[PDB]
């Protein structure tokens, strides 16, 4: 929470540095939904993937996050984001607008940036959500308290490579299935592993509930990632 | 041995010294001279005031604390305001609660204890002012010397600040004369004024130069400035 | 302060000790039904009012306290000893026993050696008195360490004073009388003044004896003070 | 590099000494006390021609009988002025009378001490000239430093040009100066020390009189005193 | 239940002349039907040429006179020994009394 | 005591509020507006205890206006009413509750429906075709039970109110000095200031 | 002046120097203690050194009666020893008030261990330079010895020793139980357990003791007490007419 | 309670933390305010390191404080939110207690007051933000423009700019803005604002934005096309030999 | 008195490391090896009882602790740090869960809470992180059997089998070879006993090994009969006698 002679924030810059070594997460926004995809940090055969969750978190029923950084620091923030969503719903009898939940979390982060002598959270979030004001939304927040909206974005390891590739293949009139495909391809080329297998991935979508007129959150099961990995020509 | 041991008041040097306290003591040396002396019927403060400019005021150095007590300062003046204020309250408490004028000695002990806490706290600082305390109570006239280290001593006479040693030498030799000046206010002030002069490379002490205070048997603490001190030059 | 050095010692305490060793010399002597206390008061200037800068301090009515080092630190400690005695009396009715009073001071002083935000006390305190079961003498160091003593000395001339005390202990196994310890204390202070004599000094003695003060703390004034000054002036010429 | 309320081996408080260096970097303020009133004048020192000189507020009212000029980090003076205004208004509420000038100054100086319960992290980076009138001690001028010390002065200058200005105030000040003379002198000494050429937009005058209180002089009235100083200092 | 108030009787009288004023009171102090004292003064010189009397519940009166005498003492300290004018005393006494608006001094006071 | 009426027609909501302010023996004012605009399409009327009434309304008004400027967006009438309810529900268990009953009439632009919420000082909320607070409801509810139709125009809504007011001028003990009438529709909020001698 | 030398943060090797230095402090008094269990008693012995002739020997002790049933011997400087003593007395009195039975030896050990753990983790508190040995005849467990250190560690013991010459005493005791095949002193009177304890202290240290060189505490069912010099002398006379 | 003093004096009499906050402002994207005869115009720029952004949902640099006053900034974005919230609360509070919306000056004095307090509080760093605050006083037609910096200083400006390369644009504005004749129309006021931004931005593309404030809560944000009309007109008009 | 250091003692370095967390992990490396293996009808957690002198009583030291009737924990690193985490864990299982829902928390959620306690020591002022890694084995009705590792940073992850401390590298490899998803509980115990044999130097018996299981319900460990709707704790410490019996057929 001190300034450098240049006017940068030491602990912030170093926290971003910390994040740059974490498993990659990508968010892609479509006309009819949103994809979230994340890669697990150098895993093992004995690590459970069934009862496992480390990068993809449900905030309420209309909003999910992808985590790059310190898992434990993120759980702290996820918990208060969940509580903040419920206060808003209790107060107004309406689900929280995506931007409002995001502004709040970023404000918390900003606090550790300006006062108290405590280290910032070593976490960056990609937010995927839907509300009836703006439709599908994709946001990013980092330890500096800064947030911005995206059509497609990445956090963690190899963001430069990942961002180059997304810029190359993304187009405004994409469907969700193309976005799912783009997500896996972009992770395929930015991995630090041999090849992309199912047990190294977390995957989520926010679609328009197939047939209903309602909004659905799907956190893919191991087998579902394994299956989606076949069609796309990666097996 | 002098290095990383003057950071705060909460740290002893390997010698056993407290440097922040010693440095506070140093602000006294750089302060304008003041003299205290007493007989058996009266006690007197003479303070030479110092100006910033020829256009400026000669900053007031004597503070009344009760009808029977008061003091003169050398060093950080704001610190003399905190401490005399505390002394005013303590004198006041003694009156309201016990209908009792506060003994000069108790005032000494109280000031000592207040300064002491600031030589042991973290993030605080020692006081940077010396104080000469005179009073007339149930045991007669008294002079006290307060040091920011928290050491207070009772004396017949003394001086503090810039070149105090001149006046302190004179008073050491004049001892048996001034102590006998009983029931004769003006001669005790004169003995004080001639004491403060042994410490002046400055000059002829003028009308705005001088500040005098007296307390005694039937004299409430009163401060004389300018006009009223002209007859002592 | 909350810092052990690699040898297991506390360097801030160790430095506080230096401030004590730098101080005026003071003593305590246990006698058969009481305790006597004495101190050396340096006459900085002739302008000091004689007999008017009292150093020895009373706690409750039965405990005497004397110290060497930073005088304000000693005063701070006595104030706390006073609150501590009062609190014991309020609750338990009986006046605070000396062993009990010693641990109260002990624990407080020790607490100022636990935290980096506080400094230790720059005094060694010699204190004691007469309680429900006899006379007690104690000395307390900046570390919070204290023990019972037959005789105690601290300050600049502690070594010569301790030497004198050891001689008294070894040559009076039967015990010393309060009246005698009073004179003896005067001797020892004068003898101890040898190690701090680039300045003239004033002697101050107090005592607490069952037969001489009914077990109350009292200053030695007047004739009895002079008799001791005379006895001491004699055995140095 | 160890503490905020730390003493140097000379016995000065580091932070207090450095705050004074900040004041020397500030724009000049000058005060002159007479038996007809007290004059306060300031150097606006606009950082650009686009800065609207009128929005530069370095002379402020405290009460009808008390005004004040600042020099240094002027943003720090806001809470000082606010505290001075409160202290003066409060005194009138409790006592049905005007606060004495010294008392108000002492109050401001009490606030200054509260750095290091001491809720303030550093000393103020600003000095104040406090001028006013009261029944007992007449027209008065005070210099209030961020140390908590204050000084009464017949005349005083603070800011970047204070060293030169004070010597000039020494030669020029006498116990018989009229109000009109004093106004001219402030303008003159300001003209000397100002890095720019003194006109009605980069300098400002004000005074306090018993009869009319604290008035800030508007530009039109100041320009006249300029177009009179130049003429008085042409014949000689 | 404890009643924190009592009534000590008394009667006080102030008259202003052209260049003088008087404040008088009886010296009798009472509880119910008893005389506590035949001579207990209740008109006081408070310094600065001000006389004061706070009559009613004598405990409250004594407290108030004390606090005003002290007020005068501190006015001298804080305001370079200035004489406290009579209008200024009055206003100050308003604030003393009103500070206890919700647990009042049961006195009628005249200066 | 004071009349606070609300009627929800097909394309608007109409609020009617008495103009009298009476303390003790005196009618002090005969032109009081017992209403605060919360947002361009949401209006609140209030009655209850003397001080509490305006302080609460103005406090709610400040809060909604703040939300508006922060999000550059107008909250729905349902969201505003839930905010107001929770405030009152918190208030009722505090040291000194707000003794204020409210009606909230708003036009929901997203749904294109008018809405009327009735909320009492306890934080008891309900949505209704017509509503009232205090004694006046003891006359109007049954009257509107009879004469009200869900598909009425705004003009019919005003004639329905005329009946409500007329009945209250016949049977209520106190002189409430007529009503101010306000309409909340797709175009916002306007005042029909000409109802008293119509 | 690296910070990991002065406060209780980790060093690069995952160490806490302040704690290590606190262990060093425990030997400052140059005293050894040992504890052994009898059939139905528990004994603690500690050396007693009174160098200064001016001291009153009766006040120089490192054994503490924590409660009716629990004793404690400390290895370390006296200020820290007494701080730990006062706290344990408070803790034991509180426990009895809150829970209606006497605090067991091991529970107080654990409680003190946890307190020390805190100083191990929080920067503003230094550890205490002490090792505390707690002894009792526990109403559920029987003879008990539980020992805590500046790291916050504690464990129960068959027997134990503490001080500069700890290792010598420990191995001496290990060798005794190695041979005897049991985990206590098979002796019915506590006097003989004390006699055992002193005998093995003499052997491991290669020193004869007089009555003023030792300090003895005994725990029995429903009492812990310390021995007087004359009690100890009687114990010393008996070991002479045998060993 | 962490109250360790971060903003302190250096021997030369500077507060380095405040000083470095200004460096973060200089790092921040450019902002410009210029006030005409009957309007005040604000203008900003957008950075380039990423451009796969969503335009609809990303926070714009001009914020309404009340319906008649706006605030723009250069510096730390996260820091500026905190000032904007606090300013918005104060604007509502002023309405509630005074029954009048804030004067532009009052809102400026408040925000500057907040920035100041953060320069002298234990355990807090100054705002890495400098602001321009513009609008109209209720029931008044005289246009208002003010700037605040991290220290807490504030003043009114005929025209001003802050942020990166503000040196260059303040150069421009000093040559071009005439006190005697302010840009008498909204159109010719936006003209001077675009010209001043053109020196730093590169293209009038997805980077330059404008907001016009007129009296009585009349605040309209421009669209890409309406800006492109000013962009196309000047580049080819002011190139001739 | 009072607390001074109100700032984080764990900060980010220019390389993005959090030093104190690394150093805590280094402390965990020195620690005695401990392990856990998940079966189809059980979980086993096991460690070595490294005695300091044969005079110490090994049984009095708790290295494997019951957290709830269905949840256990073991650790590697600093013993006293573990011991206070066990106390806070047990208490939070009550204050944050049982006193609210009248049932003990599911494994993942208690693990989550411990992880919270450890994260806080990573960010609060005046504290250092805990110098332990924990393995928490448990059962709950809706998730069945699970095993988790919690590290000094507060990070946690589920494992089929794993090891921490000294011989972790070699032991992880040993487990990888031997673990299939069809193992009965008795097989996992036997595999655990084999794995722990590599790490130990001195004696290797039932008095130097601590081993607990999360298996079937133990009705005879309940304390009372008459409410058929609970049949007792799933956590069980194996006795010294039971460990030795399985060693003879090793």
Curated annotation (Swiss-Prot), chain A:
Under Pfam families, the record lists: Proteasome, Proteasome_A_N
Where in the cell does this protein reside? Answer: Cytoplasm; Nucleus
> Which keywords fit this entry according to its UniProt record?
Cytoplasm, Isopeptide bond, Nucleus, Proteasome, Ubl conjugation
GO CC entries: cytosol; nucleus; proteasome complex; proteasome core complex, alpha-subunit complex; proteasome storage granule
Q: Which InterPro entries match?
A: Ntn_hydrolases_N, Proteasome_alpha, Proteasome_alpha-type, Proteasome_asu_N, Proteasome_bsu_CS, Proteasome_sua/b
Instruction: Please give the SMART domains that the UniProt record associates with this protein.
Output: Proteasome_A_N (SM00948)
Question: A biological process (GO) annotation for this entry?
Answer: proteasome core complex assembly
Residues joined by cross-link Glycyl lysine isopeptide (Lys-Gly) (interchain with G-Cter in ubiquitin): 90, 189, 221
Q: Where are the annotated coiled coils located?
A: none
The similarity annotation says: Belongs to the peptidase T1A family.
Record's subunit section? The 26S proteasome consists of a 20S proteasome core and two 19S regulatory subunits. The 20S proteasome core is composed of 28 subunits that are arranged in four stacked rings, resulting in a barrel-shaped structure. The two end rings are each formed by seven alpha subunits, and the two central rings are each formed by seven beta subunits. The catalytic chamber with the active sites is on the inside of the barrel.
**What other comment is given for this protein?**
Present with 17100 molecules/cell in log phase SD medium.
> Under what name is this protein listed?
Proteasome subunit alpha type-3
From Swiss-Prot, chain G:
- Coarse class of the primary localization is cytoplasm
Q: Which Gene3D superfamilies does the record cross-reference, listed alphabetically? A: Glutamine Phosphoribosylpyrophosphate, subunit 1, domain 1
Point out residues bearing the modification Phosphoserine. Answer: 228
Q: Which key words are in the record? A: Acetylation, Cytoplasm, Isopeptide bond, Nucleus, Phosphoprotein, Proteasome, Ubl conjugation
What SMART domains does the record point to? Proteasome_A_N
Location in or out of the cell: Cytoplasm; Nucleus
Q: One of this protein's Pfam families, by short name? A: Proteasome
Covalent S-S links between cysteines = none
The protein's matches in PROSITE patterns, at most eight in alphabetical order, are given as:
PROTEASOME_ALPHA_1 (PS00388), PROTEASOME_ALPHA_2 (PS51475)
Cross-link type Glycyl lysine isopeptide (Lys-Gly) (interchain with G-Cter in ubiquitin), placed at: 223
Q: Give start-end ranges for the coiled-coil region(s).
A: none
In which family does this protein belong, per the annotation? Answer: Belongs to the peptidase T1A family.
Q: What does this protein do?
A: The proteasome degrades poly-ubiquitinated proteins in the cytoplasm and in the nucleus. It is essential for the regulated turnover of proteins and for the removal of misfolded proteins. The proteasome is a multicatalytic proteinase complex that is characterized by its ability to cleave peptides with Arg, Phe, Tyr, Leu, and Glu adjacent to the leaving group at neutral or slightly basic pH. It has an ATP-dependent proteolytic activity.
What does the record's miscellaneous section state?
Present with 15200 molecules/cell in log phase SD medium.
Q: What is this protein called?
A: Proteasome subunit alpha type-1
Q: Which organism is it from?
A: Saccharomyces cerevisiae (strain ATCC 204508 / S288c) (Baker's yeast)
UniProtKB/Swiss-Prot annotation, chain H:
* A Pfam family per the record: Proteasome
Q: Does the keyword Signal apply?
A: no
Q: Which UniProt keywords apply?
A: Cytoplasm, Nucleus, Phosphoprotein, Proteasome
Q: Which CDD domains does the UniProt record give? A: proteasome_alpha_type_7
**Entry-annotated residues carrying Phosphothreonine:** 58
Q: How does it assemble?
A: The 26S proteasome consists of a 20S proteasome core and two 19S regulatory subunits. The 20S proteasome core is composed of 28 subunits that are arranged in four stacked rings, resulting in a barrel-shaped structure. The two end rings are each formed by seven alpha subunits, and the two central rings are each formed by seven beta subunits. The catalytic chamber with the active sites is on the inside of the barrel. Interacts with CIC1.
Which function does this protein serve? The proteasome degrades poly-ubiquitinated proteins in the cytoplasm and in the nucleus. It is essential for the regulated turnover of proteins and for the removal of misfolded proteins. The proteasome is a multicatalytic proteinase complex that is characterized by its ability to cleave peptides with Arg, Phe, Tyr, Leu, and Glu adjacent to the leaving group at neutral or slightly basic pH. It has an ATP-dependent proteolytic activity.
The misc remark on file is: Present with 16800 molecules/cell in log phase SD medium.
Protein family? Belongs to the peptidase T1A family.
Protein name, per record: Proteasome subunit alpha type-4
Q: What is the lineage of its organism?
A: Eukaryota, Fungi, Dikarya, Ascomycota, Saccharomycotina
UniProtKB/Swiss-Prot annotation, chain I:
Assembly description: The 26S proteasome consists of a 20S proteasome core and two 19S regulatory subunits. The 20S proteasome core is composed of 28 subunits that are arranged in four stacked rings, resulting in a barrel-shaped structure. The two end rings are each formed by seven alpha subunits, and the two central rings are each formed by seven beta subunits. The catalytic chamber with the active sites is on the inside of the barrel.
Source organism per entry reads Saccharomyces cerevisiae (strain ATCC 204508 / S288c)
Check the record and name the InterPro entries matching this protein: Ntn_hydrolases_N, Proteasome_alpha, Proteasome_alpha-type, Proteasome_asu_N, Proteasome_sua/b
Which compartments does it reside in? Cytoplasm; Nucleus
Q: Name one Pfam family in it.
A: Proteasome
Q: What is its biological role?
A: The proteasome degrades poly-ubiquitinated proteins in the cytoplasm and in the nucleus. It is essential for the regulated turnover of proteins and for the removal of misfolded proteins. The proteasome is a multicatalytic proteinase complex that is characterized by its ability to cleave peptides with Arg, Phe, Tyr, Leu, and Glu adjacent to the leaving group at neutral or slightly basic pH. It has an ATP-dependent proteolytic activity.
Cite any additional comment in the entry. Answer: Present with 7060 molecules/cell in log phase SD medium.
Q: Which UniProt keywords apply?
A: Cytoplasm, Isopeptide bond, Nucleus, Proteasome, Ubl conjugation
UniProt keyword Magnesium present: no
Q: Where is this cross-link: Glycyl lysine isopeptide (Lys-Gly) (interchain with G-Cter in ubiquitin)?
A: 108
The similarity annotation says: Belongs to the peptidase T1A family.
Xref: SMART domains:
Proteasome_A_N
Does the keyword section mention Cytoplasm? yes
Q: Know the name of this protein?
A: Proteasome subunit alpha type-2
Q: Which gene encodes it?
A: PRE8
